[PDB]
Amino acid sequence: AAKDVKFGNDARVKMLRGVNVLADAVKVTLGPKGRNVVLDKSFGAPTITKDGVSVAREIELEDKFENMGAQMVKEVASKANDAAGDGTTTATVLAQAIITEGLKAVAAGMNPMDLKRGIDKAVTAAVEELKALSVPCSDSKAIAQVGTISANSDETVGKLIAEAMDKVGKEGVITVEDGTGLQDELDVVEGMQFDRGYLSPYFINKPETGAVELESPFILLADKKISNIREMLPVLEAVAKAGKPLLIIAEDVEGEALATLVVNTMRGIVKVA
Amino acid sequence: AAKDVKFGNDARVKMLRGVNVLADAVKVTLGPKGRNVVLDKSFGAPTITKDGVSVAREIELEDKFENMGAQMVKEVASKANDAAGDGTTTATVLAQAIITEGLKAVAAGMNPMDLKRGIDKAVTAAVEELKALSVPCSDSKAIAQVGTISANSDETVGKLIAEAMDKVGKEGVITVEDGTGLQDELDVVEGMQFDRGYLSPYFINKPETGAVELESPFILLADKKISNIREMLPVLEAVAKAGKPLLIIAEDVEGEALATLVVNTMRGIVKVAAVKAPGFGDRRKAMLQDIATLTGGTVISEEIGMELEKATLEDLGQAKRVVINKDTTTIIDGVGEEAAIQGRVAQIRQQIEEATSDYDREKLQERVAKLAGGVAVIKVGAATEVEMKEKKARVEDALHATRAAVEEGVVAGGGVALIRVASKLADLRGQNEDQNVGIKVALRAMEAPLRQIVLNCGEEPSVVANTVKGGDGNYGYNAATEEYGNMIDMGILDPTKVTRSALQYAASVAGLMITTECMVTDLPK
Amino acid sequence: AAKDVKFGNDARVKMLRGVNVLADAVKVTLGPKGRNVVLDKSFGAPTITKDGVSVAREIELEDKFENMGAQMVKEVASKANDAAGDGTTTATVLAQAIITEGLKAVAAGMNPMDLKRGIDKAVTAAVEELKALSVPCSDSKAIAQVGTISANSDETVGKLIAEAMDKVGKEGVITVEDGTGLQDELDVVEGMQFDRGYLSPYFINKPETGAVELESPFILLADKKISNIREMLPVLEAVAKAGKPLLIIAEDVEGEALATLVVNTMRGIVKVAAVKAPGFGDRRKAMLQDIATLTGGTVISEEIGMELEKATLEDLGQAKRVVINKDTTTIIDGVGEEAAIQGRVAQIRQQIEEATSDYDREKLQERVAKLAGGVAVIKVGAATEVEMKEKKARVEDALHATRAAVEEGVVAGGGVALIRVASKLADLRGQNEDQNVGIKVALRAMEAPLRQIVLNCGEEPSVVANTVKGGDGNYGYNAATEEYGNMIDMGILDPTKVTRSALQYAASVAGLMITTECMVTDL
Amino acid sequence: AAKDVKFGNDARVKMLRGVNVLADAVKVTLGPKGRNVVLDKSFGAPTITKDGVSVAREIELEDKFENMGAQMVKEVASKANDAAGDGTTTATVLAQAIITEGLKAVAAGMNPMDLKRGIDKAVTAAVEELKALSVPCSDSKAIAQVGTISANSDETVGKLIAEAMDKVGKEGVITVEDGTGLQDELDVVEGMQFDRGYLSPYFINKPETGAVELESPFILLADKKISNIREMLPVLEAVAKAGKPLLIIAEDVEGEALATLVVNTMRGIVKVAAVKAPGFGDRRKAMLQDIATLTGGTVISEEIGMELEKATLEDLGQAKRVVINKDTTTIIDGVGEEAAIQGRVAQIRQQIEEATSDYDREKLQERVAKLAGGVAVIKVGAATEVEMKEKKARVEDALHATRAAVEEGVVAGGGVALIRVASKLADLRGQNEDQNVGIKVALRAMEAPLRQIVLNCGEEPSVVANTVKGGDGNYGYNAATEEYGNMIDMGILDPTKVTRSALQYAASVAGLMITTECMVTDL
Ligand SMILES: Nc1ncnc2c1ncn2[C@@H]1O[C@H](COP(=O)(O)OP(=O)(O)OP(=O)(O)O)[C@@H](O)[C@H]1O
Ligand SMILES: Nc1ncnc2c1ncn2[C@@H]1O[C@H](COP(=O)(O)OP(=O)(O)OP(=O)(O)O)[C@@H](O)[C@H]1O
Ligand SMILES: Nc1ncnc2c1ncn2[C@@H]1O[C@H](COP(=O)(O)OP(=O)(O)OP(=O)(O)O)[C@@H](O)[C@H]1O
């Protein structure tokens, strides 16, 4: 319906209030001495965590403008997350510092475009200086150390990543699985990796894991577009008679086949990814 | 329900409040130093953009009267967008300036009808002066420059448009596609273009793209009206058995067939897109024969005896790709043999030779032109599918602005075009004091875009505008480097068509809406 | 206290709303078709008055900015009433029109100070054109016409004023008072007049007219200033049981040893007034002797030696009525002795015959003119109280208009003269374009009284104004007969002093009022 | 009382909002295109005034923090009016500009103490540059130009002031008073002036001007201080029925045995004033004798032996008018005897010829200068009351500007001089970077009066300021004709005292106000 327009330093201060709220919530958890943040869950016990990703993802404010400044900072925090894998709290703390001093400077009347030009000039110099300052991590010991630090100071995880990196070399493929035994296990078996995502987000069996894990599935290889699901009807019949998950590799998938597969997955009769 | 009327200067001030809100929101983004505007999205992250189109389309106010003043200015801004391809912010800034000074003058008691007569007199003189001031853009370098400026100062897009412009000549066909590689690609293949829109807006596969893009579709050619869908039932069965998108070209489509096809499209069982048959009579039939030759299809007519029910997969034409724009449909890499296309070209060239009527001869000439020149395809190359879609949109509207510059001309951008037009029209008078005030309103309001650009740069708009007025010719203020100079030397150019259309529609809405007294709307409920 | 501050067009439209309120209340009384306005009063009954200045004075608005606008325009009517006593409604309408057109021109972006200069130049030229266009008033028939037109087309009032000016002369004093029967009466009685005012503003009686009246006053005179209260207390003491209010005429009356304790002594049952004596030295002694002989009293002096303690009730003078005004103090009717009054007049006549100095001759001739003219008293007849006050106000307006006519002259009535002198100024130009716009504002506004008269008639004002502008000379539109004719020949005359003062004051105030950007008031 | 406490930028933005309110109300009156402001009054009609200091004074805001900001800026206009009487609007605009840019620099994180030091250093250097750039005023044509420009481009005012200084000399006393006709009148009458003030603040009359005026006062003089009230009661007693207000000139007047019971005795009908006598001993006796002869009165002394009880009304002096001000008390017109006044002037002249001591010669020459110069009285002609008050205020501003010009000098008008001395100070630097930022704040603020004048014209202030900065010398932008030219040649001149005082006071107050972190007020 009708929509509210707010501009000027009033909009900037509403937005700054929002980003201050979000950055407070997630910057509480920064570092190894990061204080716990409790996300009050709608069901059961409230989840308590020091995960900046988990804390940031849940923040949304009652006022629309504060909410939406928080939304932008959270979105770029998640952009730094999936770009790297860690450092959401670091990204949000840096964002809060830069935005606080920047909007304070803009309220002092300095030109925001020139101010941004100064900011990105300085961060470009910072990026090149950091590249010059960077130390290679080809050795296994620093690999184990960074794997430890990333997993909340767990030496075992960094260790396992170290033997995995030794096993598959510098640019090999490493995949995590669940083991029945209490001890950690490591194996090397010939496999495949190719960079393609799922057609639909509903194909994920575990939304918390974020990946479609299928055990003993039938894999179909196709170089043609699946325009109609009638091509997939005998495949569905065969995989339902056999009774195993189904994986499909095709050139393109049109709206019809994808919608039918989404309906089938909602039905619970086949597992098709 | 019941409805609330407001008239007099009260309605005009509610209207003015609304147009001030909308024009503020969109004029923040004017120029290359346009400040970001954040559109709060109902889901996920908000879209932060400097696109005056996106900001304007988003604005709607809580008060009905302010809302509807904003609706009027937004609608005429979008009208200038579709007419030209760019310059919504320029159109809205001009509209705000003219409307502000005009409503102020009307509150000073001058006759609104005479004031509008002054406004449209001044803008008619401005259009004539801008035509006189326009510089042709037949050269490739200014074409690349305007393609760059249209796509937010991207030299690569202007470069690609330049090579496509060289490929297809002065009036050729250029179409944007997506490429797999990170590098940009350019190809030239024989194709088709005809100016017809989709039957229904739901036929668009991508509402954000706005065009129906079908890859390897079956094309049906018909010269008869599809009154019943029972004629399309065997076609639907065949295209569902084959499993490809379907394109339909027919004379007319009635409510029954269109409704059934729309229902099928919500069903998701078939991809059917229908377009009208362009042209009329014998010219229509001949060009449909040309399209059938291009795609290997067959034209179905009631007068011949051929029926739509007797449809086989061989009879329908086929092509590698088709794209249906708002009112234009193009075909890329048709299946039909190039030798048959050359034979058809020779036949219509002999038709040109035997042509005696000027209209028929020019129709045959444009037919042989579209059959012989072909279509250039620019495949966007980048790393991410996201930036793929933004660069595809940038190439689209940049090439639209580029062809706008090509068809009419180009003038030194940065708003100095209207500045020079205003400086060269200071002596235009009106038949009385009211029309004279209208002239003065329009002349002082043509300086609004340059002032707004400079204001977004943070400088003082008054001194910069006075210095630009003091200079003569193409001398103005480069906002990008924040330095003065000649735009043509430094490649800051705007199509004559976009500035002319923006000014014309801004003056149109301002004159049409200054003379508004009564403002009827529903009660706030 | 906290001050609300408004800027630019906000302040200007609040001002204009207040001005429109006040000037519409005033303007519904303009012309012979003008309608009376009922003014509320708490102490007495409501007053149904057609007097413009009364309505203008009593307009006080709740909205403080509109209140300031109304007060500034009310100053126009007050100053017009001060200078002329008639034409307050014309002055207010002209002020409204100048304000409206000037605010339109300001909204058109024109410079307001230049508009004020243009308005003032146009009005200076228009006053010069009125002086050129003015016709002297004489024959006592033009006087009757002026009186009738000034009194809402009341011919009896015009004839009565004409008879009064025929009796006491064109410069003799005339006093309008409440009547006794239904009919107005003319009494050419013996009295005194002198241009002096009251010393203290606390001498104002219950009426708001500003002139204090005494019922059968007791007259005391002096040329040498007394020293102590105790020398003058016995006189008051005698007056304290005389029965008659006391009026003292002296050189100059203090506040310290008279005013404070004369306020503190009584609560206001019977009032005591003190006034200055005109002239100085021998002349002042001469007028004091003349007034004492007129009232039958005596003058205390150092040379005589007779003292206020020795003065009795019979020694001092007595009058039937005295009305004191700031501009001029007049003793209405003093009994004295008619034979003694005649003897004093004759003695002053041989004083004229003996004297040869120009100053002495002119002052003695003023003395004999004042003594022979006497006082004309007009009894305003009406059936009820509010009708009496309304008719008294109309007769007062007629009197002031006739006096303005004899002082300065007459022109065409019904705003025709302003129309003509505006037409004659169509070529007037200033230093720049904004001043020319102000001149045009003034010229357009000068048409406003005529259009307002025609509006009060109910006819279309624009066609009538265009018709009147079409002709020339004293041709205009008689509102009473709703038809076109010669203004002078049909008897509709306006005092040139009244019209000139109205235009000047409206021009000054409105040209100041259009130039305001800010207004500062309370919350 | 509960005190609201605000800290830092909250207090600073509340202050700035109040400052913007007051300084905008003031700044809409700047320049020849400046517009009047309507001030509400309860006792009288609203005053339409262009006087900047008045608009500054009656700004009082509801928001207590904004009120405090407005009061601190109002101090700028009040001090400018005190020192110079003109340029209050310029002072307020400069104060606003310094406050605005200094608060911007504070929000930029710079040290406010250092900003204040930089501002004060820049303003000291700018005052030196103004002294260097100042041109002496003479020829009586520059005087007319100064008067005209100071009075909103009123050439009649400038010519009248020029004639006044040509009559009574460049150092003679001139008094501006309410006129009687529509035209201003010049009266070179005989009077006295002396630099003394009123003893008690309860002597202030109904006008808020701070100078108490007396209508035909009665003069009493003394050199030896009296002891008891009873010795002086008969004099009052005589005055208590004389008719004229009493002005006493003595060595030093108490509050105990005069002021309390003179307040308690009368309620304020006729006012009594008491003032100090200039000089001491023989000099004080000499000026008392001179004033007594000017007014026709006598001086009581121990050596003479004549006592106040023996003094009568005829023995003491009398004047036509007296206006008493704290800075200088002037007797406007004392009748006395013209032959006696001439004889006293001649006697003082042979006293000059006989005397040879430098102090005696200079004081006797001051005596003859005061006696020969007399008093210039200017009757401010206007049609109505509010026009009279506005024109009187403008003529007062012109008078104060001309006096400042003859005291100190003139510079280019229209803020051009401030522009030039800012350009000459572009190389000025302080002890650190924050002081340099304060200097830049001051220099940018000196451009503000010119840009505000141009804004009141309605032109683009930035291009006009840049054009004026482009030129050199007295080249500026004549706002009246909206054209660029030599400021001296077309006569736009500003008193160097006015400009220097405005800059100094705006600098001091604004440099103090930019440095506030906290504000403590009521709830
Ligand atoms: N470097 C530059 N210096 C000066 N003016 C420039 C420069 N680059 C672009 N402009 C001007 O800025 C305007 C372009 O602004 P912008 O791209 O934000 O919007 P638009 O072209 O008016 O339309 P839309 O917002 O609908 O895309 C044009 O008037 C163009 O001439
Ligand atoms: N019969 C008439 N025809 C035309 N004009 C008339 C007639 N009678 C009076 N007038 C005009 O009307 C005005 C007098 O009306 P009115 O007395 O109500 O107003 P005023 O003189 O402005 O002052 P006030 O209302 O205070 O007495 C004058 O301009 C006079 O010329
Ligand atoms: N015609 C003119 N052109 C340019 N500047 C002018 C002109 N007339 C006056 N000025 C300038 O305007 C100022 C005078 O305006 P104004 O009198 O309103 O303000 P002020 O001197 O600061 O004090 P105040 O408002 O209290 O009288 C001076 O700076 C003077 O030089």
Side-chain angles (χ1 to χ4, degrees), chain B residues 166-218:
Chain B
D166 310 330
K167 284 314 167 304
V168 289
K170 59 153 177 42
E171 303 306 314
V173 190
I174 297 161
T175 304
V176 60
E177 290 192 354
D178 289 298
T180 64
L182 194 141
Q183 69 280 343
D184 298 314
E185 298 170 15
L186 167 71
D187 50 297
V188 176
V189 287
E190 286 304 313
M192 186 66 204
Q193 181 183 4
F194 63 92
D195 43 356
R196 279 301 189 178
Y198 41 74
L199 270 295
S200 69
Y202 190 77
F203 286 160
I204 314 165
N205 52 351
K206 312 183 186 71
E208 53 96 17
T209 305
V212 186
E213 166 197 356
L214 310 178
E215 306 175 3
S216 298
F218 291 165

Side-chain angles (χ1 to χ4, degrees), chain D residues 26-35 50-54 77 80-81 85-93 145 148-153 393-394 398 401 411-418 449-450 453-454 456-457 476-483 487 490-495 498-499 502:
Chain D
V26 170
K27 83 168 47 175
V28 296
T29 63
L30 191 50
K33 299 297 191 302
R35 302 154 179 255
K50 199 172 172 294
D51 189 13
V53 65
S54 307
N81 191 44
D86 202 12
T88 68
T89 308
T90 296
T92 306
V93 167
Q145 294 171 345
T148 293
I149 293 302
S150 184
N152 190 0
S153 302
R394 287 198 289 105
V411 287
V416 174
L418 290 174
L450 168 62
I453 293 168
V454 180
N456 292 6
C457 301
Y477 173 72
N478 182 2
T481 44
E482 291 85 4
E483 59 88 19
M487 281 285 126
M490 61 215 77
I492 311 171
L493 275 67
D494 285 351
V498 160
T499 304

Side-chain angles (χ1 to χ4, degrees), chain B residues 402-432 434-462:
Chain B
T402 313
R403 76 170 69 247
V406 169
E407 69 93 24
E408 188 169 358
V410 72
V411 189
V416 305
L418 298 167
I419 297 282
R420 291 302 197 275
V421 165
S423 73
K424 277 194 218 167
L425 291 190
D427 45 354
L428 190 77
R429 286 294 168 267
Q431 301 164 350
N432 65 335
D434 302 2
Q435 293 181 352
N436 218 347
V437 168
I439 299 289
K440 274 316 221 173
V441 167
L443 276 296
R444 302 189 312 270
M446 281 155 228
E447 306 187 353
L450 172 63
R451 294 181 185 274
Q452 183 59 223
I453 293 173
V454 173
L455 187 61
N456 287 324
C457 300
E459 310 280 344
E460 294 267 40
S462 61

Side-chain angles (χ1 to χ4, degrees), chain D residues 434-457:
Chain D
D434 306 359
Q435 290 194 10
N436 293 343
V437 170
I439 290 173
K440 292 312 177 184
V441 160
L443 296 187
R444 168 58 189 79
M446 321 185 58
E447 314 179 5
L450 168 62
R451 309 174 95 101
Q452 174 59 28
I453 293 168
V454 180
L455 268 177
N456 292 6
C457 301

Side-chain angles (χ1 to χ4, degrees), chain B residues 29-32 52-53 86-90 149 413-415 453 477-480 492 494:
Chain B
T29 73
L30 182 51
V53 179
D86 207 18
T88 61
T89 50
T90 297
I149 295 302
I453 293 173
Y477 180 65
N478 189 349
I492 309 182
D494 289 352

